[PDB]
């Protein structure tokens, strides 16, 4: 909506909001990211530290599908299954633990960030973290690996 823009208010003011001394010229500092090392040195070192230089090894033909490993924390581990399972597990007196297969839900690794409710589980995952295992055992569950 041009009727709301600033140019509608600048009609009649000579310099059009760019000053009389320092006219609005074409490219007073160079085009694009020019002078990153010479006359824009301060800006690049104050707001983009680490911009210039090489670091690390090169991986020529990178396929993102090999390093694919979505993770899930223990705090929302119980959100993968329906609530009916979570309440029938505590209601159950046999002690049968429900099975929570994360790779079916879409995750591979299980990280132990949160606290777990005190009732056993059987977590089927592809990988585990050390804390994630230690928390599952403490609740009384079991860590089942799959491939």
């Amino acid at each position: 909506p041009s009727r709301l823009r600033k140019t509608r208010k600048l009609r009649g003011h000579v310099s059009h909001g760019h000053g009389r001394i320092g006219k609005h010229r074409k490219h007073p500092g160079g085009r694009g990211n020019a002078g990153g090392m010479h006359h824009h040195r301060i800006n690049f070192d104050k707001y983009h530290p680490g911009y210039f230089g090489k670091v690390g090894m090169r991986h020529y033909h990178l396929k993102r599908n090999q390093s694919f490993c979505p993770t899930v924390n223990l705090d929302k581990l119980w959100t993968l299954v329906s609530e009916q399972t979570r309440v029938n597990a505590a209601k159950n007196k046999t002690g049968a633990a429900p099975i929570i297969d994360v790779v079916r839900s879409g995750y591979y690794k299980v990280l132990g960030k949160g606290k777990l409710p005190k009732q056993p589980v059987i977590v089927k995952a592809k990988f585990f973290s050390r804390r994630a295992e230690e928390k599952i055992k403490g609740v009384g569950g079991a860590c089942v690996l799959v491939a």
């Binding site: 983009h48 599908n65 790779v103 079916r104 059987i122 585990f128 079991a142």
Partner: protein, 210 residues
């Protein structure tokens, strides 16, 4: 000239991009032309399915996707061999065939052979000439119920197997998952160097005895 704080932007607009801008104003016209051509094709092959031939069940490569199942290009030749279908007849009854596929597993092979059995049973075959119903052709009455099928024929639904709640035993209670991951990760890493030093250790025993 960068202002106070922002990103270092690299817009790829240094060529003559304005001469090669593809606008999409024909998009609604293309969607219409596609649909009309799709319906015109369905009327041309009226009793046959609109989607086309059946595709096989297929895993995905690239560990990101191997838990899912697609529709392949066509059935492999050994899937047709076990299903008792000549490879030059399957296209004539609507069975996609591609000779490039191999079968490394048996369940993928058996899942598609089981799929062709389910299709060959659901197939209403018309006689070559209505005057003389031949052998493999359908009985006269179900030709009256043969109508065009819409959507992908026998759609591939990626289904899971639910597991009943079990009581945890002691071995799976005492299984050290993280330790076994780090251990097995190290065994694969130090497998070649260990086999070398162990073979090397045979070099000095023969020198020590003799």
């Amino acid at each position: 000239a960068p202002s106070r704080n922002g990103m270092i932007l690299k817009p790829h607009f240094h060529k003559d991009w304005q001469r090669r801008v593809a606008t999409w104003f024909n998009q609604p016209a293309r969607k219409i032309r596609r649909r009309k051509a799709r319906q015109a094709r369905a009327r041309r092959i009226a009793p046959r399915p609109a989607a086309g031939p059946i595709r096989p069940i297929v895993r995905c490569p690239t560990v990101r996707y191997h838990t899912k199942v697609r529709a392949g290009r066509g059935f492999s030749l050994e899937e047709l061999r076990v299903a008792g279908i000549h490879k030059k007849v399957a296209r004539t009854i609507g069975i996609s065939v591609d000779p490039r596929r191999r079968n490394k597993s048996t369940e993928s092979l058996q899942a598609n052979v089981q799929r062709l059995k389910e299709y060959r049973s659901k197939l209403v075959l018309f006689p070559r000439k209505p005057s003389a119903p031949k052998k493999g052709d359908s009985s006269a009455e179900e030709l009256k119920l043969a109508t065009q099928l819409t959507g992908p024929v026998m759609p591939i639904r990626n289904v899971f197997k639910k597991e009943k709640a079990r009581v945890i035993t002691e071995e799976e209670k005492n299984f050290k998952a993280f330790a076994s991951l780090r251990m097995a990760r190290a065994n694969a890493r130090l497998f070649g160097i260990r086999a070398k030093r162990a073979k090397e250790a045979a070099e000095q025993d023969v020198e020590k005895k003799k």
